[PDB]
Amino acid sequence: QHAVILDQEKYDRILKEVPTYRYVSVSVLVDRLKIGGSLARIALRHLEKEGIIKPISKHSKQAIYTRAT
């Protein structure tokens, strides 16, 4: 039921919609999107190292991520 595997036609759904998201976490990347929870955690940690989204507090079982600047 959920896109557990990311591909190109799903990849553009993340990279064009993660800007303007005030709140970014594992549950909002599966509610708004269709990708699974495990890949959502992969997407969040991937999108931090380049730096298009910012961290507010790093904890397990919950994340708090917002835009840049």
Binding site: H2, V4, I5, L6, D7, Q8, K10, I42, H46
Partner: protein, 145 residues
Amino acid sequence: SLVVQEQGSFQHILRLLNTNVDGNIKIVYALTTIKGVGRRYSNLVCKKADVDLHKRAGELTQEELERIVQIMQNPTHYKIPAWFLNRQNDITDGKDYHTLANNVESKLRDDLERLKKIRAHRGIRHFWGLRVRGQHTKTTGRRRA
């Protein structure tokens, strides 16, 4: 400790050992649907096959799907210490047999049908289907078995 990006060379549902196995879920917990294969056995089989456990059981390749089955049907040859198996010290030929999908019910059927022929108590209770491990049937098990 790091996580690398991956691309979707995904494949559809698949069939192993005459049993449907779904994709979309991790490889170790996908082989658990095979009868006679549990979480511990499927975890051992994968690491013996030297595969990534984050491979979702649907983006693997035919070479490592052939590899996991060979280890699964031949435990001892792939460094399995014989205390990890389903049936240990077989009553017939004294070998350590790990039982697989379609053979778990048949071997279990043979074992119970043995004790019925033997007229042993653990099989006698199976003939009526009652509790065979000595649990009290005073106020319990009023729906099945």
